Design a protein around this ligand. Structure first.
Ligand code: NA
Ligand code: NA
Ligand code: NA
Ligand code: NA
Lengths: 123, 123
């Protein structure tokens, strides 16, 4: 199983997804960088359009939005047996353009591990 | 601390809140009864109006909505240092009127333990 942890690291920083199964429903906590937080929450089922809450900036200043919980939700949506809630909060102090670019492949890498896990542990 | 678990039991069924601190942000997972699930997600900060996602019924049939994540959010809102996400999913097979009535005091009981914990462990 009811809990699993997935990690990836590209361009020198790590992202992590912690998955918890509750009933037929999923909770996925996505964090990364030096300052993990909860900046976005995406909710969905297999058959509804995902929706995303965006909290005010965890440190007040402006950071580019990489759409991480939305991107993960799109990848895993068709594998869901019930509801799904994805939090995301990645922060790298003085992030570089290459590290920004790595956010999308790293999210897909976590998504692929999650999908494999769900297929191995049907709920 | 960064993680704590709170429980209550009234009228013969248990509710549980698992709290995880990520940065300055909170994730609270509220479950109970025989069939824990994620049926509602409430998001808020100290200064914004809470909003609640309601997923389709975890078992297809109609159950009364006890507004659990909303009720907890109202109780703890003024103590938040950052963002807060509360999932809730309580199910008792053939719930009784007394057990339905117990949902509100039990949510307040979990909320009071959470507030005490936050005051003892400032983030
Ligand atoms: Na691993
Ligand atoms: Na944001
Ligand atoms: Na306790
Ligand atoms: Na509901």
């Amino acid at each position: 199983a009811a809990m699993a942890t997935f990690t990836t690291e590209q361009a020198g920083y790590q992202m992590q997804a912690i998955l918890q199964v509750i009933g037929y429903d999923l909770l996925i906590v996505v964090t990364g960088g030096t300052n993990p937080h909860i900046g976005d929450v995406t909710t969905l089922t297999a058959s509804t359009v995902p929706e995303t809450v965006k909290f005010p900036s965890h440190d007040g200043r402006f950071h580019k939005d990489n759409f991480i919980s939305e991107r993960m939700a799109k990848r895993i949506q068709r594998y869901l047996a019930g509801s799904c809630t994805i939090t995301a909060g990645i922060h790298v102090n003085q992030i570089t353009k290459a590290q920004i670019a790595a956010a999308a492949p790293m999210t897909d890498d976590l998504s692929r591990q999650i999908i494999s896990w769900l297929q191995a542990h049907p709920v």
